[PDB]
Design an enzyme around this catalytic site. Structure first.
Site, PDB file in Angstrom:
ATOM      1  N   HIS A  53       5.806 -13.093 -28.932  1.00 15.46           N
ATOM      2  CA  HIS A  53       6.897 -12.181 -28.545  1.00 15.46           C
ATOM      3  C   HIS A  53       6.632 -10.753 -29.025  1.00 15.46           C
ATOM      4  CE1 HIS A  53       9.016 -15.906 -27.892  1.00 15.46           C
ATOM      5  NE2 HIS A  53       8.900 -16.251 -29.172  1.00 15.46           N
ATOM      6  N   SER A  76       2.719 -11.168 -24.991  1.00 16.19           N
ATOM      7  CA  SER A  76       3.910 -11.910 -25.413  1.00 16.19           C
ATOM      8  C   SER A  76       3.806 -13.378 -24.996  1.00 16.19           C
ATOM      9  CB  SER A  76       5.133 -11.303 -24.761  1.00 16.19           C
ATOM     10  OG  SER A  76       6.307 -11.855 -25.274  1.00 16.19           O
ATOM     11  N   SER A  81      10.962 -11.784 -23.816  1.00 18.20           N
ATOM     12  CA  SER A  81      11.149 -11.516 -25.255  1.00 18.20           C
ATOM     13  C   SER A  81      10.598 -10.159 -25.712  1.00 18.20           C
ATOM     14  CB  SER A  81      10.505 -12.618 -26.079  1.00 18.20           C
ATOM     15  OG  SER A  81       9.125 -12.712 -25.811  1.00 18.20           O
ATOM     16  N   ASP A 131       1.947 -18.596 -30.548  1.00 19.08           N
ATOM     17  CA  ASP A 131       3.325 -19.032 -30.728  1.00 19.08           C
ATOM     18  C   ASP A 131       3.657 -19.833 -29.484  1.00 19.08           C
ATOM     19  OD1 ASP A 131       6.149 -19.211 -30.789  1.00 19.08           O
ATOM     20  OD2 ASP A 131       6.367 -17.279 -31.814  1.00 19.08           O
ATOM     21  N   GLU A 156       2.418 -20.566 -34.775  1.00 14.80           N
ATOM     22  CA  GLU A 156       3.715 -20.141 -35.297  1.00 14.80           C
ATOM     23  C   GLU A 156       4.810 -21.200 -35.245  1.00 14.80           C
ATOM     24  OE1 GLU A 156       4.388 -17.225 -36.771  1.00 14.80           O
ATOM     25  OE2 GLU A 156       6.560 -16.915 -36.595  1.00 14.80           O
ATOM     26  N   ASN A 181       4.180 -22.895 -39.054  1.00 16.98           N
ATOM     27  CA  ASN A 181       5.567 -23.314 -38.959  1.00 16.98           C
ATOM     28  C   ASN A 181       6.063 -24.042 -40.202  1.00 16.98           C
ATOM     29  OD1 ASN A 181       8.007 -23.663 -37.055  1.00 16.98           O
ATOM     30  ND2 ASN A 181       7.602 -25.754 -37.718  1.00 16.98           N
ATOM     31  N   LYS A 186       8.731 -20.319 -43.616  1.00 18.89           N
ATOM     32  CA  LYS A 186       8.777 -20.146 -42.185  1.00 18.89           C
ATOM     33  C   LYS A 186       9.859 -21.116 -41.682  1.00 18.89           C
ATOM     34  CE  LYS A 186       7.895 -20.005 -37.798  1.00 18.89           C
ATOM     35  NZ  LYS A 186       8.540 -20.874 -36.789  1.00 18.89           N
ATOM     36  N   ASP A 190      12.966 -18.757 -41.009  1.00 21.62           N
ATOM     37  CA  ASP A 190      12.967 -18.353 -39.605  1.00 21.62           C
ATOM     38  C   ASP A 190      13.725 -19.343 -38.721  1.00 21.62           C
ATOM     39  OD1 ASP A 190      11.793 -18.667 -36.877  1.00 21.62           O
ATOM     40  OD2 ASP A 190      10.121 -17.336 -37.528  1.00 21.62           O
ATOM     41  N   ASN A 191      13.288 -20.601 -38.678  1.00 23.89           N
ATOM     42  CA  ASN A 191      13.830 -21.528 -37.677  1.00 23.89           C
ATOM     43  C   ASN A 191      15.334 -21.724 -37.877  1.00 23.89           C
ATOM     44  OD1 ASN A 191      10.974 -21.850 -37.854  1.00 23.89           O
ATOM     45  ND2 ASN A 191      11.045 -23.832 -36.821  1.00 23.89           N
ATOM     46  N   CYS A 195      17.925 -18.250 -36.413  1.00 27.40           N
ATOM     47  CA  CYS A 195      18.834 -18.639 -35.356  1.00 27.40           C
ATOM     48  C   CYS A 195      20.309 -18.439 -35.795  1.00 27.40           C
ATOM     49  CB  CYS A 195      18.570 -20.084 -34.932  1.00 27.40           C
ATOM     50  SG  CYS A 195      16.976 -20.213 -34.105  1.00 27.40           S
ATOM     51  N   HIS A 315      11.872 -23.415 -27.602  1.00 31.00           N
ATOM     52  CA  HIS A 315      10.764 -22.581 -27.117  1.00 31.00           C
ATOM     53  C   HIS A 315      10.636 -22.452 -25.595  1.00 31.00           C
ATOM     54  CE1 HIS A 315       7.081 -20.248 -27.626  1.00 31.00           C
ATOM     55  NE2 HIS A 315       6.619 -20.901 -26.581  1.00 31.00           N
ATOM     56  N   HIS A 374      15.001 -12.785 -34.118  1.00 29.57           N
ATOM     57  CA  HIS A 374      15.323 -12.813 -35.527  1.00 29.57           C
ATOM     58  C   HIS A 374      15.144 -11.430 -36.137  1.00 29.57           C
ATOM     59  CE1 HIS A 374      15.210 -16.966 -34.869  1.00 29.57           C
ATOM     60  NE2 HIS A 374      14.156 -17.303 -35.572  1.00 29.57           N
ATOM     61  N   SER A 382       7.760 -15.415 -42.030  1.00 28.55           N
ATOM     62  CA  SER A 382       6.885 -16.025 -41.074  1.00 28.55           C
ATOM     63  C   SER A 382       5.587 -15.259 -40.959  1.00 28.55           C
ATOM     64  CB  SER A 382       7.520 -16.090 -39.704  1.00 28.55           C
ATOM     65  OG  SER A 382       8.798 -16.636 -39.785  1.00 28.55           O
ATOM     66  N   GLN A 386       1.528 -15.864 -41.496  1.00 30.71           N
ATOM     67  CA  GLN A 386       0.485 -15.629 -40.457  1.00 30.71           C
ATOM     68  C   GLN A 386      -0.669 -14.837 -40.979  1.00 30.71           C
ATOM     69  OE1 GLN A 386      -0.270 -16.700 -37.678  1.00 30.71           O
ATOM     70  NE2 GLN A 386       1.495 -17.492 -36.589  1.00 30.71           N
TER      71      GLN A 386
HETATM   72  N1  LIG Z   1      14.296 -19.264 -30.551  1.00 33.72           N
HETATM   73  C1  LIG Z   1      13.728 -19.133 -31.720  1.00 33.72           C
HETATM   74  O1  LIG Z   1      13.605 -18.011 -32.240  1.00 33.72           O
HETATM   75  C2  LIG Z   1      13.030 -20.339 -32.344  1.00 33.72           C
HETATM   76  C3  LIG Z   1      12.713 -20.338 -33.703  1.00 33.72           C
HETATM   77  C4  LIG Z   1      12.004 -21.398 -34.257  1.00 33.72           C
HETATM   78  C5  LIG Z   1      11.682 -22.484 -33.472  1.00 33.72           C
HETATM   79  N2  LIG Z   1      12.058 -22.495 -32.171  1.00 33.72           N
HETATM   80  C6  LIG Z   1      11.852 -23.652 -31.234  1.00 33.72           C
HETATM   81  O2  LIG Z   1      13.028 -24.420 -31.221  1.00 33.72           O
HETATM   82  C7  LIG Z   1      12.693 -25.811 -30.975  1.00 33.72           C
HETATM   83  C8  LIG Z   1      13.224 -26.665 -32.103  1.00 33.72           C
HETATM   84  O3  LIG Z   1      12.486 -26.335 -33.307  1.00 33.72           O
HETATM   85  P1  LIG Z   1      12.829 -27.056 -34.671  1.00 33.72           P
HETATM   86  O4  LIG Z   1      12.010 -26.417 -35.735  1.00 33.72           O
HETATM   87  O5  LIG Z   1      14.317 -27.123 -34.796  1.00 33.72           O
HETATM   88  O6  LIG Z   1      12.335 -28.545 -34.350  1.00 33.72           O
HETATM   89  P2  LIG Z   1      12.856 -29.848 -35.098  1.00 33.72           P
HETATM   90  O7  LIG Z   1      11.875 -30.946 -34.791  1.00 33.72           O
HETATM   91  O8  LIG Z   1      13.153 -29.520 -36.591  1.00 33.72           O
HETATM   92  O9  LIG Z   1      14.279 -30.227 -34.430  1.00 33.72           O
HETATM   93  C9  LIG Z   1      14.469 -30.616 -33.041  1.00 33.72           C
HETATM   94  C10 LIG Z   1      15.554 -31.655 -33.061  1.00 33.72           C
HETATM   95  O10 LIG Z   1      15.953 -32.022 -31.712  1.00 33.72           O
HETATM   96  C11 LIG Z   1      16.304 -33.386 -31.760  1.00 33.72           C
HETATM   97  N3  LIG Z   1      16.324 -33.917 -30.399  1.00 33.72           N
HETATM   98  C12 LIG Z   1      15.245 -34.252 -29.617  1.00 33.72           C
HETATM   99  N4  LIG Z   1      15.566 -34.706 -28.427  1.00 33.72           N
HETATM  100  C13 LIG Z   1      16.953 -34.694 -28.437  1.00 33.72           C
HETATM  101  C14 LIG Z   1      17.915 -35.084 -27.489  1.00 33.72           C
HETATM  102  N5  LIG Z   1      17.608 -35.650 -26.315  1.00 33.72           N
HETATM  103  N6  LIG Z   1      19.216 -34.919 -27.807  1.00 33.72           N
HETATM  104  C15 LIG Z   1      19.530 -34.424 -29.011  1.00 33.72           C
HETATM  105  N7  LIG Z   1      18.716 -34.071 -30.008  1.00 33.72           N
HETATM  106  C16 LIG Z   1      17.431 -34.204 -29.648  1.00 33.72           C
HETATM  107  C17 LIG Z   1      15.265 -34.019 -32.670  1.00 33.72           C
HETATM  108  O11 LIG Z   1      15.681 -35.260 -33.232  1.00 33.72           O
HETATM  109  C18 LIG Z   1      15.124 -32.954 -33.765  1.00 33.72           C
HETATM  110  O12 LIG Z   1      15.910 -33.240 -34.922  1.00 33.72           O
HETATM  111  C19 LIG Z   1      11.171 -25.833 -30.764  1.00 33.72           C
HETATM  112  O13 LIG Z   1      10.891 -25.625 -29.390  1.00 33.72           O
HETATM  113  C20 LIG Z   1      10.711 -24.617 -31.576  1.00 33.72           C
HETATM  114  O14 LIG Z   1       9.405 -24.131 -31.219  1.00 33.72           O
HETATM  115  C21 LIG Z   1      12.701 -21.459 -31.598  1.00 33.72           C
HETATM  116  N1  LIG Z   2      11.968 -10.913 -33.690  1.00 34.42           N
HETATM  117  C1  LIG Z   2      11.028 -11.826 -33.453  1.00 34.42           C
HETATM  118  N2  LIG Z   2       9.744 -11.412 -33.320  1.00 34.42           N
HETATM  119  C2  LIG Z   2       8.797 -12.330 -33.081  1.00 34.42           C
HETATM  120  N3  LIG Z   2       8.916 -13.656 -32.967  1.00 34.42           N
HETATM  121  C3  LIG Z   2      10.204 -14.037 -33.121  1.00 34.42           C
HETATM  122  N4  LIG Z   2      10.698 -15.308 -33.128  1.00 34.42           N
HETATM  123  C4  LIG Z   2      12.041 -15.195 -33.316  1.00 34.42           C
HETATM  124  N5  LIG Z   2      12.460 -13.948 -33.437  1.00 34.42           N
HETATM  125  C5  LIG Z   2      11.292 -13.204 -33.336  1.00 34.42           C
HETATM  126 ZN   LIG Z   3       5.878 -18.563 -28.390  1.00 38.00          ZN
END
Ligand SMILES: NC(=O)c1ccc[n+]([C@@H]2O[C@H](COP(=O)([O-])OP(=O)(O)OC[C@H]3O[C@@H](n4cnc5c(N)ncnc54)[C@H](O)[C@@H]3O)[C@@H](O)[C@H]2O)c1
Ligand SMILES: Nc1ncnc2[nH]cnc12
Ligand SMILES: [Zn+2]
Ligand SMILES: NC(=O)c1ccc[n+]([C@@H]2O[C@H](COP(=O)([O-])OP(=O)(O)OC[C@H]3O[C@@H](n4cnc5c(N)ncnc54)[C@H](O)[C@@H]3O)[C@@H](O)[C@H]2O)c1
Ligand SMILES: NC(=O)c1ccc[n+]([C@@H]2O[C@H](COP(=O)([O-])OP(=O)(O)OC[C@H]3O[C@@H](n4cnc5c(N)ncnc54)[C@H](O)[C@@H]3O)[C@@H](O)[C@H]2O)c1
Ligand SMILES: NC(=O)c1ccc[n+]([C@@H]2O[C@H](COP(=O)([O-])OP(=O)(O)OC[C@H]3O[C@@H](n4cnc5c(N)ncnc54)[C@H](O)[C@@H]3O)[C@@H](O)[C@H]2O)c1
Ligand SMILES: Nc1ncnc2[nH]cnc12
Ligand SMILES: Nc1ncnc2[nH]cnc12
Lengths: 461, 460, 460, 460
Positions: A53, A76, A81, A131, A156, A181, A186, A190-191, A195, A315, A374, A382, A386
Site C-alpha cells: 500500500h 501498491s 490503498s 504484503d 507483511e 506478521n 506487528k 498493527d492487525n 483496525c 486483505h 493505520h 510493523s 520489515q
Molecule cells: N486491513 C488491514 O489493515 C489489515 C491488517 C492486518 C491484517 N489484515 C488482513 O485481515 C485478515 C485477517 O487477519 P488476522 O491477522 O485477523 O487473521 P487471523 O487468522 O488472526 O483471524 C481470522 C479469523 O477469521 C476466522 N474465520 C475464518 N473463517 C470464518 C468464517 N467463515 N466465519 C467466521 N470467522 C471465520 C478464523 O477462525 C480466525 O480467527 C487477513 O486477510 C489479513 O491479511 C488486514
Molecule cells: N497506513 C498503512 N500503510 C501501509 N500498510 C498499511 N496497512 C494498514 N494500514 C497501512
Molecule cells: Zn497487501
C-alpha cells in the site's frame, strides 16, 4: 531528469513531503533504525522489489530502506490503498513507484510488472518486500530466473504468510522468507490496534453514519476481528461476533460480545432457508475480517436489513460475494468508494428506492480504501520489523550459498524475540513510557538476562 | 469417616447448595462427567491434589472422583479455602485438610496429611498442583513416592516455571502437563478471572470507591492485563509498570500510561532512586508479576497515606511484608484487612493518618478477600486439568520400560484440538453459536472443518 | 439570475444523493414532514436562516419548505459548509450563500445576501440562528426588519447566552425559543454529537494515533463530556480542566483526573503561573467552554512540542490564535491544518521540531476538519427547530400592538411533552421499543400514561 | 446507657475502626464538622432519623451530634443495617434501633422507638428520612408531634414523590428539603453509587461471572443509568426497558438496545403479551424504577432457567415476590439468597434445574447483599443532609404564626452555591484542581468568580 515512475499527479509531492515529515515524528522505531544504521549502510547493494500500500507510512519505510543503502522499485498491493500525495513525494525523490488510487485490475498487474522489469528486461533485484503475496506469486510463476538471485522475501500480512507456507509445504518456495506478521509488535499491534483506529474512521468518512446505538455483525475474531469489534463497540455499537474457531469465540464472549452465526445452528446448507433471516434483518453494519472466502455470501446479502452498510477489512475482496452483486443488482455511486447496491434488479434503479445496501470500497480493504489505513505510530512497529527482516535476509545472502547450504536455510521464519522487544522499547519510549529495569536478583529469579528476552518463545502475550 | 480436617463440618449443607449451583455454571466439566462416566478412565488413580479449596475446586474434585479416582486434598494457600466447600467435600467421604486462615505450620501439616495415610505414605500415583509446593515436597522429602507416580498436572504460571527449571536441571522425576498454557486456561482464567475478582476483593475488604482514584499495577502479563481492566472499568486512573517492553507496548495501546516506581526505571535499592512524586499520588498498588520484591520497602515508605496495597500473583513475596512486620505496627480492621501504621513498631495512635491498608497479608487477594475466580471461568481451567489427568494416568509412565521413560520425561501442553473442544463447551454455555466452515472455505484456509483452526504458533 | 452563491453547482447531484441517505437517518424530522404536510403550518413564513450549511441542515431546510416556508440561508461558520449540500439546496431553487473556506468579509456578505433580496430588505418574518451572528446583525443594522419578525429560534449554548444578555439589557426586540435546552438537543447533540465528531475531525486532519497519548480537555459541560468520551474511548489518557466544581466532580467520577493549566488553579497572567510540567506532557488540547482565552498564549508556549491544538466550542477566541498569528510562523499542511512554528515569525525551517498543529484555525473542529455531527443525532436538534419555528410563527408576535409586544418578550423552551415526542421518534429509529405504563403504574408514580413522565425539575 | 437495640454490642470496636476509615473517605462531611463545630448550629435540634444504618450513616449521625444535635435513629430497610455500625453508634451513647434481618414487625417497632422516649412522644423538632416511612407514620399517627417539627430533609427519589403528593393534597404539615435533587446527590449517589454497588452485591450473593451474559435493566433514570454501567463495564450484554422516551433515547446513545418485556410495549396483563424469546435469554434482571410490579408474574414465569432477579429501587414491590411466595418453593442458599423453584409450592427437588435466584428477597440489593454505596460517594449526599438540617432548623417554621407558615410550607432544594461547595470538597478529595476564572472570564460568561457557575435550568 527522473521519469521512471507512474503516479496520479506529481504536483502533489510537496504536500506528501509535508506529511512525511510529520510521519517521521510519529515513527520513532523506524527513525531509530535510520539513525542507528545510516553509518554502516547494511543494505548497500540491496535491490528491493516492494509491493505494499503506497501510503505516507510506506513512504517512511521506503526512505528508511534507501537511507540504509538500498535501491527499490515499488508498487501498491491494492487498487484503492495508495495515497496519491505519498506516491508523488516518493517519485519526486527519485524512487521508482508505480501506484495510484483507483487502479483497474489490469493497471494493478502492470504496476507490479514495472517494478520487476527495468527498461524492458528483468531488474537486478535481490530482495522482495511483499504484503499479501501477489508479487511473490508473479515472481515464482513468471520469473523463476530472477528468484535465483533473490536472497529473501519479507512478508507483511497474515494472508501472504499463509501463501508462503503453502509454497513451502508443496516444495515450490524458491527463496527463504521472514514472516513479519508474527512479530508481536506487528500482529498484536498493527492487525488489532490498527483496525481499532481505522475501521470506524473509514466508515465515518464514507457514510458519516452515527454508529452508537446501532447493530453490527463482525465476521471473525482473530487479530483484525478483535480490533474491529473494539472499533465499533467503543463508539457504542451493539456488536455481535461470528467465528468458526471456538477459542476465538470464547474470547469474544469474555470480552462482552454475543456470539452468533448468520446460519441457523451455524450450518450453511447452501439454501436461503439456512439463513438466520431474523438476525440479519436487524443488522445495520457487517464487517468481514477473516482472510477466508465468501463469509458474507449472496444469501446473507439478500437477508440483510435495508440500508445496511457492508465492508471488508481482510486483505482480499472475495470475503464478500461482490460478483453476485455485480451480476444481479444495480450500483449507484454515491461518491468515490461508496456505492448503493439496489436489490430491486440489475438494469437501473429508482433514485428513491429504500431497498439497497451501502458497499464501501467495492469490498476491498475498507480502512485503506475509504480512509488512510493505520496511523503512523502503529505502522512504526510493523515497518521497523520489515527493515530488520530485510537486513537479516540480505546479510544471509541465500542466493550466493552453495546448494547444500541453501537446503538448510530454505524456511519461513520469524524474527528473534530480542528484536521484537527492541522495536517495542522504541514504541514505548515514543509514548513517554518508562520501562523498569530488573535487579540482578529479579532477573535470576525469573531466569532471564536483565536486557531480555523476557519471555519464552511459547509465550502468547 | 474421620480422615479430614476442616474448620466446621456443619457448613457442608451450604457448601453442597453452592456446588449444585456451580455445576450449572461449569458446562465443560459437567460435559466431561457425562462423556467419561462409562469408561471410568481414572479408575485406580490415586491423586494428591494441592489447589485452593474453593467451591470451584470442589466441582473439580467430584469430577475426578466421578471418573474413578480417589484423592487426598489440601489447599495451596493459607487464606484461599472456602470453609463451606471444604466441609462439603469432607462430608462426601473425601480426605481434605484445609481451612481459611491457616498458619504456615498448619499449611505444611495439611500437605503432609495428603501425602501420608494412616501414618505412612499413601500409594499415590498422580499429582495435581497449583504453584509447585506439593511437587517440591515430593521431590525433596519423598523421592521414593515419585517412582510410582505417572504424572503431574500443574495449574499456574509460577508452578510451570518451577517445573521447567527442574527439567532443565535434570531433577524432574515424572512427566508433567503444563495446564496453564492451554488458551482456555491462560487467556481465560489468568486474565478474565482477575478482571472479575480483583475489584471484587478490594471492595469486600475496604468498600472503597475506586472511580476517580489513582492505581499502579505492577506487571502486564495475563494477570496484569486482567487486573488493570478490573480497575479501569470501575473508573480508576491506572498506570502500569513493566520490565518487558512488548507487554509495556500493549499497556500503552490499551490506554494506560507506563511508569516506573524508580527514576528512569533504575532500581539501585536506595531511597533516592524512588519516584516519590509518582508514589505519593497512588491510592492503590497491585502486584501481578510472579517475581520477588516488586513492591519494596522504599516504595512502601513513599506511598500516599492511606493507600491500599495488595498482591494477586501466586506468592506473597511480591510485596516486602517482612519489612512491614519488622518496622511498623499492624492494626487488624477485620480478618485479612490490616492497617499498617508507618509511625513505628510498638503501638499506634487509633487516629493516626499515616498508614497503609494491606489486604490478605500480601497473599493472593482475590482468594484471600473474596472467592477467587467465578465458576464459569474456572470451568475452562479445570476441564483442562481433568483431561491432563486422564492423559498422564493412561500413559502409565511409572510402569514404562526405561527406554520409553526417557522419551516421555517432558513438560508438555495439551493438544490444540482439546483446547478447542473445551472452548466450544464454554461458548455453548453462553448461548454462543459457532459457524461451521463449508468444505470450500476449509480448503481455502487450509484446515479441517472440525479443526484445529490455527497453527501451533498462533497467539490469539 | 442565480439567487444563490455556492462553490460549485456541479456538486448538486452528489449532495442530493447524500440528502436522500440523510433522510433515512432522520426519522423525527421526516415524521414532521409527514405529520404537518396537510396543515402547512409554515405557509407564509419567510425564514432567515444562519446555521452550518451541511447535509443535515439541508434536510432541515427542506422540511421547513415542505411545511410551507420560504427561506434564505447562510452558514454560521467560515469552514463548516459542505459544498455538495450547498449545491444541492441551490439546485432546488432555494437561496443559499455558503461555501467552505469563506473569508470573514465573505461571511458577512453571505449573511447580508439572506437579509436583502434584490437590493432591499426581504420581507422576512422568522429567524433561525446558531450562535447569534444573524440575530446581532439584524438588531445592529436592520432594526426596522425586526418590527415584522415573529421570533428567533436559537440552536446553541453560546447563542442562547447572547439572547439572555440582550433580554436582561432590554435590547432584544423579538421573542425567542432556546432550542439548545431541549433534552433531545443539549443531551444528545452537544454531548453525543461531539463524541462522534471530535475524534473524527482529529483523524481526518492529522491521521494521528490517539491511543496511549495524553489529552487535556478544557471544560466538562455537555460538549466537554462528549469530547472527553470521544478521546478516552480511543484509548487516550484524558485529563479534564473545569471551573465548575459540580462538572469537575462528574469528571472525577467518570474516571478522569481533574487538573488546571495553572499552578493551584490561579492564572496570574505570567508564565510563572503555568504548570509547565503538566503542559509539557500533553499531546492534544481541546477547548469546549464557550469562554474566552481558555487556551492562552502562556499555555501555548508551554505545550509539548508537536501537540495538536483545537477548539470545539462555537467561537475561535477560546484559543489565543491572535498571539500565534502575531508571533509565530504558519505552515499550511493541507486545508484547515497548520503547523505553527514557535521559532519566530518570519519563516521557518521545514524540518523544525518545535511546532504545534492547529486545526481549522481554531474554529469549531468537528465541522472544520470533518462533517460535524451525524444525521441521526442532528435529527433531534432539527426536529426541535421545526417545532420551535411552528410555535413562534403561529403566535404572531409581530402583529401585536406595541404595548403588548413589551409584555411578550421572553426566551422560552419547548414543552417537555414535545421533547418526549421527538425522543420517541429517535428511539424508534434505533428499533427501540418503549413500554407503556399500566393505569395502576401511572397512578403510582403520579403521571399520565401518555406523559410527560418527569417533572420540569428533572435533569436526566 | 441502655436506650438502644442492636444485634450485638460487642461489634462496636470493629464499627469504630471502620468509622475512622470512613471519615478519611468523607471530606465534604468532615469539612462541615470542622467548619461548624464552633458555632454549634444544631444546638437544640432533636432529630428523628430513618435511614439505612450503615457505616456511612454513622459518620452522618456523628456529624449531626458534633454540631449540637441529639438524635434517635432507625434504619429504613430490614436488610440494610451493618451491625457493626449500629453497635458503634449505640456504644457512643446514641439511641439507635436497627439490625440486619429485621422482620416487618420489628421494623415498625424500631421506628416507634425513635418516636417515643420512655413510652411518650419525644420532643422531636426535625426529621431526616429516606423513603418516607417515618414521615408517613408521623402524619398518620402522631400529628401533634408535627406541630413542633421545623422540617423534614428527605434523601431519596421515592420519598420526595411521597412528599410532593402530600403537598399537592394539602396534607403536608411541615416544610421539606428535597436532598435527592442536589446534583451532588442525584447525579452522584443515585448513578455512581449504583455503578459501584450493584455488581458488588451480585458477586457477593452469587459469585456469578457476569461477562458474556445477558442482562435486562428495567428503567434508565439515575439508578438505571448507574446499574446498566455496573453491568456493562463487567462485559454483560445489557438491554434496557423504559417508559420515558427521553431516558430511552439516552440508553440508545449510550450503546444499549432498548426493549420491552411486552409485545409492542403493551402490558395488558396477559401471558401471551410477554416476549418469551427475549425473557428466555436473560440471565439477570434488575429493577430500578421506583414503580410497582415492573418485573411481574408473567415475566418471572418466562425468564430463563437459573436467572438472577434483583431490585435496586427503594421498595421490594418492583418485583412480584408475593406471587412467588404464594406459588413456588423457596430454598435458602445463604442469607439474602434464595432459589425459587418454579416446579410448585410444596417442597422441591434439591437437583431441580427450573429455578430463579432472588437476592435480598427483592429488597434493595446493594444494601441487602453488600454494603451499599461507598463512603466517598455518600459523602456528597450526607453533606447535603447536614446543610439541609441546618437550613430548616435555623428557619424555625414551627415557631412561626399560622399566616407566616403558609408562605414557607413548600418542598425546596438547596441553593446551587451550596451544591457547588459540596462538589468542591469532593473534587479535592480526589486530588482534583479546579481552575479559578479570571475576572474578565467571569464577566464574559456572566457569573461571579466564586460561583454559582450555571443557571438554575442547567441539567449537567
Ligand atoms: N486491513 C488491514 O489493515 C489489515 C491488517 C492486518 C491484517 N489484515 C488482513 O485481515 C485478515 C485477517 O487477519 P488476522 O491477522 O485477523 O487473521 P487471523 O487468522 O488472526 O483471524 C481470522 C479469523 O477469521 C476466522 N474465520 C475464518 N473463517 C470464518 C468464517 N467463515 N466465519 C467466521 N470467522 C471465520 C478464523 O477462525 C480466525 O480467527 C487477513 O486477510 C489479513 O491479511 C488486514
Ligand atoms: N497506513 C498503512 N500503510 C501501509 N500498510 C498499511 N496497512 C494498514 N494500514 C497501512
Ligand atoms: Zn497487501
Ligand atoms: N490470583 C490468581 O487467581 C492468579 C491467576 C492466575 C495466575 N496467577 C499468578 O499470577 C502471577 C502472574 O501470572 P501471569 O500469567 O500474569 O504471568 P506472566 O508471565 O504472563 O506475567 C508477569 C509479568 O510480570 C512482569 N514483571 C516481572 N518482573 C517485573 C517487575 N519487577 N516490574 C514490573 N513487571 C514485572 C513480566 O514482564 C510479565 O509480563 C503468577 O505468580 C501466577 O501464578 C494468579
Ligand atoms: N462544535 C459543536 O458541534 C458544538 C455542539 C454544541 C455546542 N457547541 C458549543 O460548545 C460550547 C460549549 O457548549 P456546552 O453546551 O458544553 O456549554 P456548557 O455551559 O454546558 O459547558 C461549558 C463548560 O465550560 C466550563 N468552563 C468555562 N470556563 C472555563 C475555563 N476557563 N476553564 C475550564 N472550564 C471552563 C464551564 O464551567 C462549563 O461547565 C458553546 O460555545 C456551544 O455553543 C458546539
Ligand atoms: N439502592 C440505592 O442505593 C438507591 C439509590 C438512589 C435511589 N434509589 C431508588 O431507586 C429508585 C429509582 O430512583 P431514580 O433516582 O433512578 O429515579 P428516576 O425517576 O430518575 O428513574 C426511574 C425511571 O424508571 C422509569 N420507569 C418507571 N416505570 C417503568 C416501567 N414500568 N418500565 C420501565 N421503566 C420504568 C422512569 O421512566 C424513570 O426514568 C427510587 O425508588 C429511588 O428511591 C435507590
Ligand atoms: N475459585 C478458584 N478456585 C480455584 N483456583 C482458583 N484460582 C483462582 N480462582 C480460583
Ligand atoms: N451506604 C449507604 N449508607 C446509607 N444510605 C445509603 N444508600 C445507598 N448506600 C447507602
Amino acid at each position: 531528469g527522473f521519469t521512471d515512475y507512474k503516479v496520479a499527479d506529481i504536483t502533489l509531492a510537496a504536500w506528501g513531503r509535508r506529511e512525511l515529515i510529520i510521519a517521521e515524528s510519529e515513527m520513532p522505531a523506524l527513525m531509530g533504525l535510520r539513525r542507528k544504521y545510516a553509518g554502516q549502510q547494511p543494505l548497500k547493494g540491496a535491490k528491493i522489489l516492494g509491493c505494499i500500500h503506497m501510503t505516507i507510512q510506506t513512504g517512511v519505510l521506503i526512505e528508511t530502506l534507501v537511507a540504509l543503502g538500498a535501491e527499490v522499485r515499488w508498487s501498491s498491493c491494492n487498487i484503492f490503498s495508495t495515497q496519491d500525495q505519498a506516491a508523488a513525494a516518493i517519485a519526486a525523490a527519485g524512487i521508482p513507484v508505480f501506484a495510484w488510487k483507483g487502479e483497474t485490475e489490469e493497471e494493478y498487474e502492470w504496476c507490479i510488472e514495472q517494478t520487476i522489469l527495468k527498461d524492458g528486461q528483468p531488474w537486478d533485484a535481490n530482495m522482495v518486500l511483499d504484503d499479501g503475496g501477489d508479487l511473490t506469486e508473479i515472481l515464482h510463476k513468471k520469473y523463476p530466473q530472477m528468484l535465483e538471485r533473490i536472497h529473501g522475501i519479507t512478508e507483511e500480512t497474515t494472508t501472504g504468510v499463509h501463501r508462503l507456507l503453502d509454497m513451502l509445504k508443496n516444495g515450490t518456495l524458491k527463496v527463504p522468507a521472514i514472516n513479519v506478521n508474527d512479530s508481536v509488535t506487528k500482529s498484536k499491534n498493527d492487525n488489532k490496534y490498527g483496525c481499532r483506529h481505522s475501521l470506524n474512521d473509514a466508515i465515518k468518512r464514507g457514510t458519516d453514519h452515527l454508529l452508537s446505538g446501532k447493530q453490527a455483525l463482525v465476521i471473525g475474531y482473530g487479530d483484525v476481528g478483535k480490533g474491529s469489534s473494539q472499533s465499533l463497540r467503543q463508539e457504542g455499537m451493539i456488536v455481535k461476533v461470528a467465528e468458526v474457531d471456538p477459542i476465538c469465540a470464547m474470547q469474544a464472549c469474555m470480552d462482552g460480545f454475543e456470539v452468533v452465526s448468520p446460519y441457523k445452528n451455524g450450518i450453511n446448507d447452501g439454501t436461503e432457508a439456512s439463513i438466520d433471516a431474523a438476525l440479519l434483518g436487524k443488522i445495520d453494519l457487517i464487517v468481514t475480517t477473516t482472510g477466508n472466502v465468501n463469509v458474507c455470501d449472496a444469501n446473507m446479502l439478500k437477508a440483510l436489513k435495508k440500508r445496511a452498510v457492508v465492508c471488508n477489512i481482510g486483505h482480499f475482496d472475495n470475503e464478500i460475494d461482490t460478483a453476485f452483486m455485480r451480476k444481479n443488482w444495480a450500483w449507484e455511486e454515491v461518491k468515490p468508494q461508496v456505492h448503493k447496491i439496489h436489490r430491486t434488479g440489475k438494469d437501473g434503479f429508482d433514485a428513491h428506492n429504500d431497498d439497497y445496501l451501502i458497499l464501501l470500497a467495492e469490498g476491498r480493504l475498507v480502512n485503506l480504501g475509504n480512509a488512510t489505513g493505520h496511523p503512523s505510530r502503529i505502522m512504526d512497529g510493523s515497518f521497523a520489523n520489515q527493515v530488520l527482516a530485510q537486513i537479516h535476509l540480505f546479510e544471509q545472502k541465500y542466493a550466493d550459498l552453495p546448494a547444500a547450504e541453501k537446503a538448510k536455510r530454505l524456511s519461513v521464519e520469524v524474527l528473534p524475540k530480542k528484536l521484537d522487544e527492541e522495536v517495542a522499547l522504541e514504541m514505548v519510549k515514543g509514548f513517554g513510557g518508562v520501562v523498569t529495569q530488573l535487579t540482578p536478583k529479579q532477573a535470576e529469579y525469573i531466569g532471564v538476562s536483565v536486557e531480555g528476552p523476557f519471555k519464552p518463545d511459547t509465550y502468547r502475550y
